[PDB]
Amino acid sequence: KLVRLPGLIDVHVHLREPGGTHKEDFASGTAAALAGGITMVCAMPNTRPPIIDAPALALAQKLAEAGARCDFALFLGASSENAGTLGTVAGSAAGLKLYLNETFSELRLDSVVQWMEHFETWPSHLPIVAHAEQQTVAAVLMVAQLTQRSVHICHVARKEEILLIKAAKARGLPVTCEVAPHHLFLSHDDLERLGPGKGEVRPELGSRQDVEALWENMAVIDCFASDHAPHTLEEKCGSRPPPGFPGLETMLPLLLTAVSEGRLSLDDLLQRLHHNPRRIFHLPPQEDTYVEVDLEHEWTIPSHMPFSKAHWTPFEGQKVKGTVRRVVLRGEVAYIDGQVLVPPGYGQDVRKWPQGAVPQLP
Ligand SMILES: [Zn+2]
Ligand SMILES: [Zn+2]
């Protein structure tokens, strides 16, 4: 029989519009989301132009409203110049994203003083998330403590990182974190097959001991999120490959396979792709919205999934059990068996729903 799930939420996607529409756009990426059982996405701001000011946010909002097929919220990006300038639009974003390490972005903040400035000026009731690797996790936690507020750590990939977060939680610090499927299901053992172009990702793939540490410490992981980071194969295999993997269409099948193997429970999945995303990002419910999955269907991930313009996947050849059969989004059939059935523009900005505003003290 099928299993009906609530509408799942991916709090970490790169939809490339505006500026990189050859790699993906709102319409292609949201189709990929629906095919992966995802009905709500939070889009990162490392676009061109980057979403680091009110005019760029307004542009992105209209592009998303015209192109998205599922519902969404848009992150604002911290820059070396915009601390203290975001207060009037902060409430309309998913949250504030800080890039603290080298990756596919122009927004790296060089000085910890700039991190402090953002933590002090961004509204304290609104989410802050960080790309923060290895010791950078400890550094940004220290900034969060100094400014007495929470922080969310994106794509945790290392034993070192999950143990540090575990220690912080044991001391009662307000830290949450997410893990991406490639850091649960791929490792150094896969770099031979992938090669140095396809295999380029930040955070980098970890050792078998890193992967085992994440599974052993699943209780520490608040969310799963894809860090869907599409680039074309030509870009991945070029001289200077951008880091990142596409992942919306493979995330849920990989995790369902783990459920079928007893590696985690259905509830574990629903906490990490629905309940905790809702509560960490204050995201609203979606009325008359659900995902029907088939837990029996065995298949092999092909060389590319149907919808992402990335047109490749690092999970090619992996055997999975579990597939998305049907998605209903706000009372309309949005996806069935490889066919997306809602048009670009069906999706809405959840921060403009009355239930989507983040409550705050007057
Ligand atoms: Zn990142
Ligand atoms: Zn990312």
Resolution (A): 1.6
Smallest Cα–Cα separation from 95: which of 289, 350, 272, 355?
A: 350
How far is the C-alpha of 67 from the C-alpha of 17, rounded, in Å?
9
Smallest Cα–Cα separation from 132: which of 75, 186, 189, 176?
A: 176
How far is the C-alpha of 82 from the C-alpha of 116, rounded, in Å?
13
For residue 340, what is the enclosing H or E element? strand 339-340
How far is the C-alpha of 353 from the C-alpha of 145, rounded, in Å?
32
Question: How many A from CA of 143 to the centre of ligand 2?
Answer: 21
Question: How many A from CA of 80 to the centre of ligand 1?
Answer: 17
Two tokens at 212? 């085992």
Q: Which sequence spans correspond to the domains of the chain?
A: 2-349
Question: How many A from CA of 95 to the centre of ligand 1?
Answer: 14
Torsion, Cα 150 170 13 67, to 10 degrees, reads: -50
Ligand with minimal distance to 12 CA: 2
Burial 167-198 (b: 16+ CB within 10 A, else e): ebbeeeeebbbbbbbbbbbbbeebeeebeebb
**CATH class of residue range 2-349:** alpha beta
Question: How many A from CA of 135 to the centre of ligand 2?
Answer: 18
Rounded to the nearest 5 degrees, what angle is found at the Cα of 121, between the Cα atoms of 117 and 122?
A: 115
User: What is the three-class DSSP state of 262?
Assistant: coil
Q: Is 12 annotated as a binding residue?
A: yes
Q: Is 202 annotated as a binding residue?
A: yes
Q: Is 154 annotated as a binding residue?
A: yes
How many contiguous H segments (helices) and E segments (strands) does the chain have?
Answer: 12, 14
C-alpha separations of 36 from 64, 128, 360 in Å: 19, 26, 33
Q: Is 97 annotated as a binding residue?
A: yes
Residues designated as active site = 227
